[PDB]
PDB file of C-alpha atoms and ligand atoms in Angstrom:
ATOM      1  CA  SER I1193       5.320  28.031  11.828  1.00 35.06           C
ATOM      2  CA  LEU I1194       1.964  29.027  10.277  1.00 35.33           C
ATOM      3  CA  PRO I1195      -0.663  31.084  12.135  1.00 32.57           C
ATOM      4  CA  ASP I1196      -3.508  29.127  13.759  1.00 34.02           C
ATOM      5  CA  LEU I1197      -7.004  29.116  12.259  1.00 31.63           C
ATOM      6  CA  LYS I1198      -8.829  32.346  13.255  1.00 28.15           C
ATOM      7  CA  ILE I1199     -12.589  32.715  13.811  1.00 27.36           C
ATOM      8  CA  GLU I1200     -14.053  36.231  14.171  1.00 28.01           C
ATOM      9  CA  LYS I1201     -17.572  37.594  14.384  1.00 26.90           C
ATOM     10  CA  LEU I1202     -18.335  39.872  11.444  1.00 25.55           C
ATOM     11  CA  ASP I1203     -22.027  40.444  11.952  1.00 22.08           C
ATOM     12  CA  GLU I1204     -25.060  38.798  13.546  1.00 21.93           C
ATOM     13  CA  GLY I1205     -24.981  35.098  12.674  1.00 21.51           C
ATOM     14  CA  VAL I1206     -21.968  35.654  10.409  1.00 22.46           C
ATOM     15  CA  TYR I1207     -18.345  34.703  11.177  1.00 18.67           C
ATOM     16  CA  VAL I1208     -15.136  34.970   9.178  1.00 16.88           C
ATOM     17  CA  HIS I1209     -12.707  32.027   9.260  1.00 18.70           C
ATOM     18  CA  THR I1210      -9.113  32.706   8.259  1.00 21.75           C
ATOM     19  CA  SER I1211      -6.617  29.947   7.549  1.00 23.84           C
ATOM     20  CA  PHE I1212      -3.028  30.127   6.400  1.00 24.52           C
ATOM     21  CA  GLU I1213      -0.932  28.206   3.980  1.00 22.07           C
ATOM     22  CA  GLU I1214       2.616  28.471   2.667  1.00 22.85           C
ATOM     23  CA  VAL I1215       2.336  28.661  -1.103  1.00 19.86           C
ATOM     24  CA  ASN I1216       5.347  28.463  -3.418  1.00 18.38           C
ATOM     25  CA  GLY I1217       6.182  31.856  -4.836  1.00 20.30           C
ATOM     26  CA  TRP I1218       3.599  33.558  -2.654  1.00 17.03           C
ATOM     27  CA  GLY I1219       4.847  33.064   0.877  1.00 19.47           C
ATOM     28  CA  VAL I1220       2.203  32.873   3.585  1.00 19.24           C
ATOM     29  CA  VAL I1221      -1.269  33.268   2.110  1.00 22.29           C
ATOM     30  CA  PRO I1222      -4.263  34.133   4.285  1.00 24.82           C
ATOM     31  CA  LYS I1223      -7.656  32.754   3.139  1.00 23.66           C
ATOM     32  CA  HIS I1224     -10.996  34.085   4.378  1.00 26.14           C
ATOM     33  CA  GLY I1225     -14.271  32.222   4.271  1.00 28.97           C
ATOM     34  CA  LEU I1226     -17.454  32.606   6.279  1.00 26.01           C
ATOM     35  CA  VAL I1227     -19.510  30.533   8.631  1.00 27.27           C
ATOM     36  CA  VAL I1228     -23.154  31.500   8.315  1.00 29.65           C
ATOM     37  CA  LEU I1229     -25.635  30.740  11.084  1.00 29.89           C
ATOM     38  CA  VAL I1230     -29.300  30.203  10.267  1.00 30.02           C
ATOM     39  CA  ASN I1231     -31.202  29.534  13.452  1.00 30.22           C
ATOM     40  CA  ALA I1232     -29.162  26.781  15.101  1.00 31.60           C
ATOM     41  CA  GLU I1233     -27.671  25.537  11.837  1.00 33.41           C
ATOM     42  CA  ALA I1234     -24.242  26.437  10.400  1.00 34.95           C
ATOM     43  CA  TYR I1235     -23.103  26.725   6.771  1.00 33.70           C
ATOM     44  CA  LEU I1236     -19.473  26.766   5.657  1.00 32.82           C
ATOM     45  CA  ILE I1237     -18.787  29.261   2.883  1.00 33.89           C
ATOM     46  CA  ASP I1238     -15.550  27.859   1.519  1.00 37.74           C
ATOM     47  CA  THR I1239     -13.466  25.370   3.478  1.00 38.85           C
ATOM     48  CA  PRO I1240     -10.043  26.177   4.990  1.00 37.29           C
ATOM     49  CA  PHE I1241      -6.988  24.996   3.017  1.00 38.18           C
ATOM     50  CA  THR I1242      -6.659  21.761   4.982  1.00 36.78           C
ATOM     51  CA  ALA I1243      -8.654  18.927   6.549  1.00 35.82           C
ATOM     52  CA  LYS I1244      -7.010  19.858   9.871  1.00 34.34           C
ATOM     53  CA  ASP I1245      -8.333  23.431   9.860  1.00 32.36           C
ATOM     54  CA  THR I1246     -11.711  22.284   8.509  1.00 30.02           C
ATOM     55  CA  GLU I1247     -12.020  19.872  11.423  1.00 29.95           C
ATOM     56  CA  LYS I1248     -11.070  22.621  13.885  1.00 27.98           C
ATOM     57  CA  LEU I1249     -13.585  25.001  12.312  1.00 28.61           C
ATOM     58  CA  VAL I1250     -16.343  22.381  12.519  1.00 29.09           C
ATOM     59  CA  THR I1251     -15.641  21.347  16.136  1.00 30.23           C
ATOM     60  CA  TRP I1252     -15.613  25.021  17.228  1.00 30.50           C
ATOM     61  CA  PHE I1253     -19.180  25.504  16.017  1.00 29.96           C
ATOM     62  CA  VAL I1254     -20.355  22.014  17.028  1.00 25.89           C
ATOM     63  CA  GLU I1255     -19.028  22.559  20.599  1.00 24.44           C
ATOM     64  CA  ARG I1256     -21.159  25.697  20.668  1.00 23.77           C
ATOM     65  CA  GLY I1257     -24.355  23.926  19.644  1.00 26.24           C
ATOM     66  CA  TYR I1258     -24.469  24.398  15.865  1.00 27.01           C
ATOM     67  CA  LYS I1259     -25.252  21.595  13.470  1.00 24.90           C
ATOM     68  CA  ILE I1260     -23.159  21.808  10.300  1.00 24.66           C
ATOM     69  CA  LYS I1261     -25.781  21.537   7.579  1.00 24.19           C
ATOM     70  CA  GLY I1262     -23.366  22.045   4.713  1.00 22.59           C
ATOM     71  CA  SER I1263     -20.484  23.737   2.974  1.00 21.66           C
ATOM     72  CA  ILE I1264     -20.325  25.451  -0.377  1.00 22.26           C
ATOM     73  CA  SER I1265     -17.126  26.036  -2.338  1.00 20.77           C
ATOM     74  CA  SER I1266     -16.850  29.220  -4.398  1.00 21.88           C
ATOM     75  CA  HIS I1267     -14.369  27.751  -6.908  1.00 20.18           C
ATOM     76  CA  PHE I1268     -12.159  24.674  -7.390  1.00 23.35           C
ATOM     77  CA  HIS I1269      -8.771  25.852  -5.959  1.00 23.64           C
ATOM     78  CA  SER I1270      -7.819  24.043  -2.757  1.00 24.94           C
ATOM     79  CA  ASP I1271      -8.089  27.349  -0.830  1.00 22.76           C
ATOM     80  CA  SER I1272     -11.903  26.851  -1.194  1.00 20.34           C
ATOM     81  CA  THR I1273     -12.240  23.069  -1.459  1.00 21.90           C
ATOM     82  CA  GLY I1274      -9.380  21.728   0.699  1.00 22.93           C
ATOM     83  CA  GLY I1275     -11.751  20.407   3.363  1.00 21.26           C
ATOM     84  CA  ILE I1276     -14.359  18.736   1.110  1.00 19.06           C
ATOM     85  CA  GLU I1277     -12.821  15.234   1.360  1.00 21.02           C
ATOM     86  CA  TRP I1278     -12.812  15.499   5.183  1.00 21.20           C
ATOM     87  CA  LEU I1279     -16.420  16.833   5.254  1.00 23.69           C
ATOM     88  CA  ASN I1280     -17.586  14.003   2.981  1.00 21.90           C
ATOM     89  CA  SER I1281     -15.976  11.452   5.319  1.00 19.97           C
ATOM     90  CA  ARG I1282     -18.135  12.929   8.083  1.00 19.35           C
ATOM     91  CA  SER I1283     -21.288  12.839   5.978  1.00 21.79           C
ATOM     92  CA  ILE I1284     -21.529  16.593   6.016  1.00 23.59           C
ATOM     93  CA  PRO I1285     -23.157  17.627   2.688  1.00 25.45           C
ATOM     94  CA  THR I1286     -20.775  19.473   0.359  1.00 20.46           C
ATOM     95  CA  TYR I1287     -21.888  21.821  -2.487  1.00 22.73           C
ATOM     96  CA  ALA I1288     -20.156  23.168  -5.570  1.00 25.54           C
ATOM     97  CA  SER I1289     -21.289  24.208  -9.028  1.00 23.50           C
ATOM     98  CA  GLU I1290     -21.345  21.597 -11.749  1.00 21.54           C
ATOM     99  CA  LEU I1291     -18.367  23.277 -13.386  1.00 23.97           C
ATOM    100  CA  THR I1292     -16.436  23.414 -10.105  1.00 24.16           C
ATOM    101  CA  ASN I1293     -17.041  19.677  -9.685  1.00 24.01           C
ATOM    102  CA  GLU I1294     -15.965  18.956 -13.259  1.00 25.86           C
ATOM    103  CA  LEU I1295     -12.757  20.894 -12.598  1.00 27.77           C
ATOM    104  CA  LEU I1296     -12.136  19.018  -9.324  1.00 26.25           C
ATOM    105  CA  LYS I1297     -12.711  15.758 -11.246  1.00 27.42           C
ATOM    106  CA  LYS I1298     -10.366  16.784 -14.073  1.00 27.62           C
ATOM    107  CA  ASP I1299      -7.607  17.514 -11.502  1.00 29.82           C
ATOM    108  CA  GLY I1300      -8.171  14.155  -9.760  1.00 31.41           C
ATOM    109  CA  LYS I1301      -9.526  15.839  -6.616  1.00 31.45           C
ATOM    110  CA  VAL I1302     -12.474  14.890  -4.420  1.00 35.56           C
ATOM    111  CA  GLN I1303     -15.753  16.403  -5.586  1.00 35.71           C
ATOM    112  CA  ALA I1304     -18.596  17.891  -3.559  1.00 31.72           C
ATOM    113  CA  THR I1305     -21.514  15.518  -3.100  1.00 31.76           C
ATOM    114  CA  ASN I1306     -24.053  18.125  -4.338  1.00 31.34           C
ATOM    115  CA  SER I1307     -23.897  20.259  -7.471  1.00 27.20           C
ATOM    116  CA  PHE I1308     -25.921  23.133  -8.881  1.00 24.98           C
ATOM    117  CA  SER I1309     -25.901  24.812 -12.262  1.00 25.82           C
ATOM    118  CA  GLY I1310     -27.295  28.121 -13.479  1.00 23.77           C
ATOM    119  CA  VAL I1311     -26.731  31.742 -12.685  1.00 22.91           C
ATOM    120  CA  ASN I1312     -28.561  31.780  -9.369  1.00 22.68           C
ATOM    121  CA  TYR I1313     -29.017  29.194  -6.685  1.00 17.94           C
ATOM    122  CA  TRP I1314     -30.397  29.298  -3.171  1.00 17.72           C
ATOM    123  CA  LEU I1315     -28.280  27.208  -0.813  1.00 17.30           C
ATOM    124  CA  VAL I1316     -30.842  28.318   1.794  1.00 16.13           C
ATOM    125  CA  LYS I1317     -33.951  30.043   0.457  1.00 15.95           C
ATOM    126  CA  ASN I1318     -34.022  33.763   1.342  1.00 16.04           C
ATOM    127  CA  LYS I1319     -30.850  33.408   3.439  1.00 14.80           C
ATOM    128  CA  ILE I1320     -27.852  32.180   1.377  1.00 14.33           C
ATOM    129  CA  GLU I1321     -27.771  32.861  -2.349  1.00 13.06           C
ATOM    130  CA  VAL I1322     -25.122  31.783  -4.862  1.00 12.42           C
ATOM    131  CA  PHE I1323     -24.378  33.826  -7.953  1.00 14.43           C
ATOM    132  CA  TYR I1324     -22.292  33.222 -11.041  1.00 13.23           C
ATOM    133  CA  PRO I1325     -21.008  36.544 -12.507  1.00 14.01           C
ATOM    134  CA  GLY I1326     -19.003  34.889 -15.300  1.00 14.63           C
ATOM    135  CA  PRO I1327     -15.368  33.929 -15.671  1.00 15.27           C
ATOM    136  CA  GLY I1328     -12.817  35.992 -13.752  1.00 16.53           C
ATOM    137  CA  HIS I1329     -10.233  34.613 -11.325  1.00 13.54           C
ATOM    138  CA  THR I1330     -11.270  31.136 -12.634  1.00 13.70           C
ATOM    139  CA  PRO I1331     -13.934  29.969 -15.111  1.00 12.21           C
ATOM    140  CA  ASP I1332     -16.061  28.666 -12.241  1.00 12.69           C
ATOM    141  CA  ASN I1333     -15.882  31.409  -9.592  1.00 10.89           C
ATOM    142  CA  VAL I1334     -19.170  32.106  -7.821  1.00 11.21           C
ATOM    143  CA  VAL I1335     -20.058  34.566  -5.083  1.00 14.26           C
ATOM    144  CA  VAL I1336     -22.295  34.156  -2.054  1.00 12.29           C
ATOM    145  CA  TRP I1337     -24.912  36.700  -0.988  1.00 10.27           C
ATOM    146  CA  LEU I1338     -26.570  37.110   2.409  1.00  7.06           C
ATOM    147  CA  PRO I1339     -29.650  39.315   1.759  1.00  8.44           C
ATOM    148  CA  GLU I1340     -30.640  39.699   5.456  1.00  9.39           C
ATOM    149  CA  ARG I1341     -27.238  41.197   6.310  1.00  9.73           C
ATOM    150  CA  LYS I1342     -26.398  42.632   2.898  1.00  9.34           C
ATOM    151  CA  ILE I1343     -23.051  40.812   3.031  1.00 11.44           C
ATOM    152  CA  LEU I1344     -21.306  39.630  -0.124  1.00 12.91           C
ATOM    153  CA  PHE I1345     -18.621  36.941  -0.053  1.00 16.67           C
ATOM    154  CA  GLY I1346     -16.652  37.609  -3.228  1.00 19.23           C
ATOM    155  CA  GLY I1347     -13.868  35.099  -2.704  1.00 15.13           C
ATOM    156  CA  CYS I1348     -10.945  35.129  -5.127  1.00 17.37           C
ATOM    157  CA  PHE I1349     -12.955  37.084  -7.687  1.00 17.71           C
ATOM    158  CA  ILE I1350     -12.609  40.219  -5.544  1.00 15.37           C
ATOM    159  CA  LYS I1351      -9.120  41.615  -6.106  1.00 12.07           C
ATOM    160  CA  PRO I1352      -8.944  45.351  -5.230  1.00 11.22           C
ATOM    161  CA  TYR I1353      -5.122  45.709  -5.174  1.00  7.82           C
ATOM    162  CA  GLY I1354      -4.210  43.573  -8.195  1.00 10.56           C
ATOM    163  CA  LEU I1355      -5.475  40.370  -9.821  1.00  8.26           C
ATOM    164  CA  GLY I1356      -3.076  37.905  -8.169  1.00  9.57           C
ATOM    165  CA  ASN I1357      -2.452  34.478  -9.722  1.00  9.48           C
ATOM    166  CA  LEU I1358      -3.632  34.390 -13.343  1.00  8.61           C
ATOM    167  CA  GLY I1359      -2.942  30.687 -13.958  1.00  8.16           C
ATOM    168  CA  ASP I1360      -6.620  29.799 -14.412  1.00 10.54           C
ATOM    169  CA  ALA I1361      -8.002  33.289 -14.929  1.00 11.04           C
ATOM    170  CA  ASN I1362      -9.963  34.556 -17.897  1.00  8.19           C
ATOM    171  CA  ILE I1363      -8.534  38.038 -18.294  1.00  9.79           C
ATOM    172  CA  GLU I1364     -10.722  38.674 -21.369  1.00  9.19           C
ATOM    173  CA  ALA I1365     -13.949  38.086 -19.448  1.00  9.08           C
ATOM    174  CA  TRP I1366     -13.195  39.433 -15.949  1.00 14.19           C
ATOM    175  CA  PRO I1367     -14.055  43.090 -16.683  1.00 14.53           C
ATOM    176  CA  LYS I1368     -17.451  42.086 -18.005  1.00 16.93           C
ATOM    177  CA  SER I1369     -18.084  39.665 -15.096  1.00 16.80           C
ATOM    178  CA  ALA I1370     -16.964  42.250 -12.508  1.00 16.74           C
ATOM    179  CA  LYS I1371     -19.218  44.806 -14.134  1.00 11.34           C
ATOM    180  CA  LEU I1372     -22.114  42.402 -13.786  1.00  9.69           C
ATOM    181  CA  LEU I1373     -21.137  41.792 -10.154  1.00 10.49           C
ATOM    182  CA  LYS I1374     -21.032  45.532  -9.414  1.00 10.60           C
ATOM    183  CA  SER I1375     -24.530  46.135 -10.779  1.00 10.64           C
ATOM    184  CA  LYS I1376     -26.179  43.290  -8.897  1.00 10.52           C
ATOM    185  CA  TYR I1377     -24.605  43.963  -5.485  1.00 10.37           C
ATOM    186  CA  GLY I1378     -23.683  47.654  -5.599  1.00 10.47           C
ATOM    187  CA  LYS I1379     -25.688  48.055  -2.399  1.00 11.85           C
ATOM    188  CA  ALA I1380     -23.503  45.608  -0.501  1.00 10.53           C
ATOM    189  CA  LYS I1381     -22.924  46.718   3.097  1.00  8.93           C
ATOM    190  CA  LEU I1382     -19.868  44.439   3.386  1.00  8.94           C
ATOM    191  CA  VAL I1383     -17.731  42.656   0.789  1.00  7.27           C
ATOM    192  CA  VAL I1384     -15.479  39.797   1.927  1.00  8.93           C
ATOM    193  CA  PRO I1385     -12.503  38.984  -0.319  1.00  9.67           C
ATOM    194  CA  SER I1386     -10.468  35.776  -0.028  1.00  7.96           C
ATOM    195  CA  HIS I1387      -7.027  37.240   0.567  1.00  7.50           C
ATOM    196  CA  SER I1388      -7.538  40.766   1.938  1.00  5.59           C
ATOM    197  CA  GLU I1389      -9.570  42.700   4.493  1.00  6.75           C
ATOM    198  CA  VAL I1390     -13.337  43.096   4.556  1.00  7.53           C
ATOM    199  CA  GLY I1391     -14.374  46.301   2.826  1.00  6.05           C
ATOM    200  CA  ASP I1392     -17.541  47.849   1.465  1.00  6.11           C
ATOM    201  CA  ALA I1393     -19.155  47.948  -1.967  1.00  5.66           C
ATOM    202  CA  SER I1394     -16.172  49.966  -3.246  1.00  5.17           C
ATOM    203  CA  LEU I1395     -14.261  46.687  -3.407  1.00  4.02           C
ATOM    204  CA  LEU I1396     -16.531  45.908  -6.363  1.00  2.00           C
ATOM    205  CA  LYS I1397     -15.459  49.195  -7.951  1.00  4.75           C
ATOM    206  CA  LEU I1398     -11.745  48.505  -7.422  1.00  6.83           C
ATOM    207  CA  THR I1399     -12.078  44.916  -8.708  1.00  5.14           C
ATOM    208  CA  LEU I1400     -13.737  46.217 -11.854  1.00  2.47           C
ATOM    209  CA  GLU I1401     -10.944  48.821 -12.196  1.00  2.00           C
ATOM    210  CA  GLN I1402      -8.221  46.200 -11.559  1.00  2.00           C
ATOM    211  CA  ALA I1403      -9.770  43.834 -14.084  1.00  2.38           C
ATOM    212  CA  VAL I1404     -10.040  46.521 -16.779  1.00  2.00           C
ATOM    213  CA  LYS I1405      -6.450  47.547 -16.062  1.00  5.88           C
ATOM    214  CA  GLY I1406      -5.269  43.928 -16.276  1.00  2.00           C
ATOM    215  CA  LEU I1407      -6.796  43.279 -19.673  1.00  2.00           C
ATOM    216  CA  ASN I1408      -5.365  46.536 -21.073  1.00  3.72           C
ATOM    217  CA  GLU I1409      -1.930  45.824 -19.579  1.00  4.01           C
ATOM    218  CA  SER I1410      -2.072  42.405 -21.254  1.00  2.00           C
ATOM    219  CA  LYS I1411      -2.209  44.125 -24.661  1.00  2.00           C
TER     220      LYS I1411
HETATM  221  O1  3R9 Z1154     -13.407  10.271  -7.346  1.00  2.00           O
HETATM  222  C1  3R9 Z1154     -12.494  10.706  -8.056  1.00  2.00           C
HETATM  223  O2  3R9 Z1154     -12.663  11.460  -9.022  1.00  2.00           O
HETATM  224  C2  3R9 Z1154     -10.940  10.263  -7.705  1.00  2.00           C
HETATM  225  C3  3R9 Z1154     -10.082  11.458  -7.484  1.00  2.00           C
HETATM  226  S1  3R9 Z1154     -10.088  11.814  -5.726  1.00  2.00           S
HETATM  227  C4  3R9 Z1154     -11.251  10.469  -5.384  1.00  2.00           C
HETATM  228  C5  3R9 Z1154     -11.025   9.793  -4.056  1.00  2.00           C
HETATM  229  S2  3R9 Z1154      -9.769   8.631  -4.280  1.00  2.00           S
HETATM  230  C6  3R9 Z1154      -9.927   8.601  -6.124  1.00  2.00           C
HETATM  231  C7  3R9 Z1154     -10.359   7.182  -6.558  1.00  2.00           C
HETATM  232  S3  3R9 Z1154      -9.191   5.869  -5.945  1.00  2.00           S
HETATM  233  N1  3R9 Z1154     -10.933   9.583  -6.449  1.00  2.00           N
HETATM  234  O1  3R9 Z1155      -6.472  34.068  -5.283  1.00  2.00           O
HETATM  235  C1  3R9 Z1155      -5.501  34.420  -5.981  1.00  2.00           C
HETATM  236  O2  3R9 Z1155      -5.469  35.104  -7.018  1.00  2.00           O
HETATM  237  C2  3R9 Z1155      -4.129  33.934  -5.516  1.00  2.00           C
HETATM  238  C3  3R9 Z1155      -3.564  34.960  -4.511  1.00  2.00           C
HETATM  239  S1  3R9 Z1155      -3.183  34.079  -2.967  1.00  2.00           S
HETATM  240  C4  3R9 Z1155      -3.473  32.400  -3.726  1.00  2.00           C
HETATM  241  C5  3R9 Z1155      -2.188  31.842  -4.293  1.00  2.00           C
HETATM  242  S2  3R9 Z1155      -2.667  30.880  -5.770  1.00  2.00           S
HETATM  243  C6  3R9 Z1155      -4.443  31.461  -5.682  1.00  2.00           C
HETATM  244  C7  3R9 Z1155      -5.273  30.309  -5.050  1.00  2.00           C
HETATM  245  S3  3R9 Z1155      -6.939  30.891  -4.805  1.00  2.00           S
HETATM  246  N1  3R9 Z1155      -4.326  32.625  -4.854  1.00  2.00           N
HETATM  247 ZN1   ZN Z1156      -8.356  30.603  -6.521  1.00  2.00          ZN
HETATM  248 ZN1   ZN Z1157      -7.289  32.739  -3.955  1.00  2.00          ZN
END
């Protein structure tokens, strides 16, 4: 059977949640997201694959005295949005970019209740920032920046050992978007990818290199 949901401290007021799903043609896929604590309030950065793991994640932090103020999804794939329907049914505010919500809608999936558009957005002013580097892994991928800890959640945009599933990717744009990502957050202390281990700012370098190499290889 599949591994249980994992919750691990990464830094002060910052936890990594890891959930697991069997995906056809991929085998068992790990997915990392974060839980960010601001005072006594918690923010989900990406939901687990399932409502079950989302519920478990929420209860773990609620049982420890944290109010769940919201979740934000970094792109539309279920690995980031799987728990939105369950969160909505609990009246926990869900966030996604306008484009992410359009893509959820187009696929007949439940949308987040709050949307944002533009290159930058503060989910929490001075604490949790959202940034759109451009198309890459998907047209809508965004990253999440924690300035106080210098932690960058790169999600499925960060792909140091190969680009992974290209079904919705924009291979033409990814090098440019990754370049933009590298400049803005080159000083990242920690970078958290969706499907591999936490690294440092070099993960931005490797992603850029992998993207460049993928576009060339496609020609
Ligand atoms: O709101 C929507 O876009 C569609 C897709 S998923 C969401 C909940 S059930 C369905 C209307 S019956 N509905
Ligand atoms: O993120 C990706 O590129 C691939 C690698 S593991 C998982 C299988 S399909 C896609 C959903 S985010 N994803
Ligand atoms: Zn994805
Ligand atoms: Zn992914």
